[PDB]
Amino acid sequence: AEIRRPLSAVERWYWLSDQFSALNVISRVRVHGRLSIDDLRRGLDALQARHPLLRARIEHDAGLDPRWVPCERPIPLREVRGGGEEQWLREINERELPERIDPDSGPLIRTVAIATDAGAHDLLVVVPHIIADGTTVLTLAEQWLTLAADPAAQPWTASALPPAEDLRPRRFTGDEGAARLAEQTAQDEALVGRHRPGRIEPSNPVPLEARRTRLLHRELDGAQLEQLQRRAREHGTTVHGALTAALAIAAGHDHQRRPSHIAIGSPIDFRDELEPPVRPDEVGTYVATVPVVLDIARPFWEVARALTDDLGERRRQGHHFNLVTLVASAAPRCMADARPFMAFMEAEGPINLCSSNIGRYPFPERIGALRLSDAQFLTGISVNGYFVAAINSSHGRLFWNFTYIDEAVPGERAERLAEDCLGTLLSAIHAPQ
User: Fold this and answer.
1) Is 201 found in the same domain as 138?
2) 278 and 405 inside one domain
3) Which three-class secondary structure state does DSSP give residue 375?
4) Range of the domain at 86
């Protein structure tokens, strides 16, 4: 199986964004036990054979008509020989978020193994968003470790798939898909006019080519997560509602004009809705951001329930596929022509402030003789928005990784936002009933 075909329009959008400013998706996991770098290499060889998109590169004609062709280069593994407990954060902030992975040479993946001073390993999987979402980077980390450390595990190779947009239900394509997008667009414009929601506004102007994403890490322990889940269901909502409400509320407090409403995007996984469905162990990007105009001037749990109620209805109406339709219809042909669309998506698109939640990622606690912890993800932002929270529950905890565009969102501001999210959430969990 090999990838040989033009880039899809959505793929071309990610390809262009990444050229202005690196758009990498990253997973991290901690490994406890004896781990051979040779076994990690063995694992990467097998991972690359398995997945056609990990042995593909991009051919173009002076930036026109990009297409996938085979890549004969191996997946790189960078060793970091020593480090404290936060070395993984330093590698992400100083090297992996800001450095583009060259898709012309390929492959479109780079890994890191940090041998910590405490005798563990922190592994990073770094994949451009063109072929990865949070599920993709976590399943690749899991698969890598399984191939490295589990002799008993069943071998398999993956098919070369059509691009995501080509797998969409027919009702979301052609003239009907265009009609669906038109209906959502008029409704969303009406909500903006009705409610005047705030967005994240930059502290300082940063041109597209100067945009750099940085990361602030937060987490909840198992007991905090359990209480959150309990309180969420008692209030007719979910963990996603709580976390997303918390972020919208934080954005409201940070906003210069203290609006009553905040626009907030939620990337929706649509793997299961494609025809045929894409499995959670296959490579590619299969998420689309759905906006909600959220009234944040209400009791916390009402905000959370409003978010999940609205998002649920939007999902039933296929708003995630409508975004695919928009991008597939409007994605620029090349870098020279890309600025109008990027400016429109910047001013009007849903990814400005995003709560990107994959739910429970089923990362094993044990793989062969290894024990695993701290499996999580985070995403570069590039030109597509300003502030993103990446969420998953794994390994007994909930991870809440905030990425931001530096200078547009200064470090001090990012810190205030993250602290407010956590304080807001913890008040909701601990409020006396």
Assistant:
1) no
2) yes
3) strand
4) 5-149
- 220 vs 307: CA distance, rounded Å: 21
Burial class (CB in 10 A: 0-12, 13-18, 19+), 399: buried
**What is residue 362's three-state secondary structure?**
coil
Contact 62, 335 (CB under 8 A): no
Token couple for 360: 């429970």
Query: Tokens 């959502």 map to which residue?
Result: 184
Cis peptide before 364 (omega within 30 of 0): no
Gap between the Cα atoms of 261 and 248, Å rounded? 8
Q: Give the integer Cα–Cα distance in Å for 267 and 246.
A: 17
| Helix (H), strand (E) at residue 366 | strand 366-367
Contact 416, 426 (CB under 8 A): no
Closest CA to 24 of 86, 88, 94, 108: 108
Query: Roughly how many angstroms between the first and final C-alpha of the chain, as a whole number?
Result: 57
CA distance 404 to 411: 9
What technique determined this structure? X-ray
Cα dihedral 241→244→248→253 (10° resolution):
100
Q: Work out the number of other CB atoms within 10 angstroms of the CB of residue 93.
A: 18
* Residue with token string 């414009």: 189
At residue 51, φ and ψ (nearest 5 deg) are: -115, 105
Of 149, 181, 211, which marks where a domain is finished?
Answer: 149
Query: 185 and 40: one domain?
Result: no
Peptide bond into 276 cis (omega under 30): yes
Are 199 and 246 found together in one domain? yes
Residues 6+ positions from 394 with CB-CB distance below 8 Å: 138, 360, 361, 362, 363, 374, 375, 376
CA distance 283 to 259: 40
Buried b (16+ CB within 10 A) or exposed e, 288-303: bbbbbbbbbeeebbbb
Contact 7, 58 (CB under 8 A): yes
Could you give the CA distance from residue 386 to residue 225 in angstroms, rounded to a whole number?
27
Strands (E), 105-260: 110-115, 121-128, 213-220
Token pair 């590169």 is found at: 57
Report which residue type is found at 402: F
The C-alpha atoms of residue 74 and residue 126 are separated, in whole angstroms, by 14
CB proximity list for 413: less than 8 A, separation 6 or greater: 203, 254, 404
The C-alpha atoms of residue 374 and residue 385 are separated, in whole angstroms, by 27
> 145 with 367: CB under 8 angstroms?
yes
Strand order in the sheet with 56-61: 5-6, 64-70, 56-61
DSSP 425: H
